[PDB]
């Protein structure tokens, strides 16, 4: 079960990554694969037939290796681990459904949604579009502690439901950078194109390290957790080559080959990046198609085939600074009547 | 003697130890950009 979930998880994340890159290969990318898959798995609690199997297969699950109940139990357990507080990290993760006030939901669905995904149901007047957008955007703003502010830009006044996930991940560096040692330095977009950025620096530090000569890249860890950050640094003009090798096989080789090593100097930029996306094109390419058409079967939500997905949107933010890092993301799945 | 200099595009990945769920992934092509 676990190795089956792991294979699905990595395959979904890297498949999504490459599709995001394909739309604009030179842009910064920041996203949360788990936020997106959690929203879709939550949706699948109410799906049936081809609509259900397409969602679960689009998340790269094999339903003969891992049952539906085993998939939802994995999400439930994970969601619980992503709500933690300590002097080294703050983690939050939440799900919600915003539902047209009069709309009847099956008890099985609202029971499953609360138990497995932690989701409440918020009665919402979508016909007052500005107020409904503020309600949802405020929920995400609260959950991401101000970092994701405008997840919903446009919202159909005839919306029936919006399923929302957010994730917040703030982590202190075990060895913080001293801001006195941050100085403007070149960042090479390519061998011949470069800008000046504030570059943090540390001397004489012992971190997990792997020089991968076959892939022309260096892999390190900054930071002790149950989910530590891996940094992958391709040699100049080898990013495309490294991206082409991303796989479960390559990731496990990276992790298995890390060794503690004394590093003379480490330079890392101080920066923030943000991206937002509409994921309809990509989810259709992953084979999640019936959920978007009038053949959609979401009758596990309401007792009738009277709902279909209209829009899936995602926004994510990454902040890197001397004391540590902050990451946040949110996903909204918008649903119309049929 | 070893130097690690993030002055060119790089990736970051946050991986759950037990499930290999990817919580976050990023490619930084220009830290003064989008
Ligand atoms: Cl990341």
From Swiss-Prot, chain B:
Plasma. Synthesized in the liver. Like the related alpha-1-antitrypsin, its concentration increases in the acute phase of inflammation or infection. Found in the amyloid plaques from the hippocampus of Alzheimer disease brains. Changing residue 12 to V: Found in patients with occlusive-cerebrovascular disease; uncertain significance; Isehara-1. N- and O-glycosylated. It is found in: Secreted. Disulfide bonds: none annotated. Belongs to the serpin family. Although its physiological function is unclear, it can inhibit neutrophil cathepsin G and mast cell chymase, both of which can convert angiotensin-1 to the active angiotensin-2. Alpha-1-antichymotrypsin can bind DNA. Interacts with DNAJC1. The reactive center loop (RCL) extends out from the body of the protein and directs binding to the target protease. The protease cleaves the serpin at the reactive site within the RCL, establishing a covalent linkage between the carboxyl group of the serpin reactive site and the serine hydroxyl of the protease. The resulting inactive serpin-protease complex is highly stable. This is Alpha-1-antichymotrypsin. It comes from Homo sapiens. The chain holds residues 390 to 423 of 423 of the full protein.
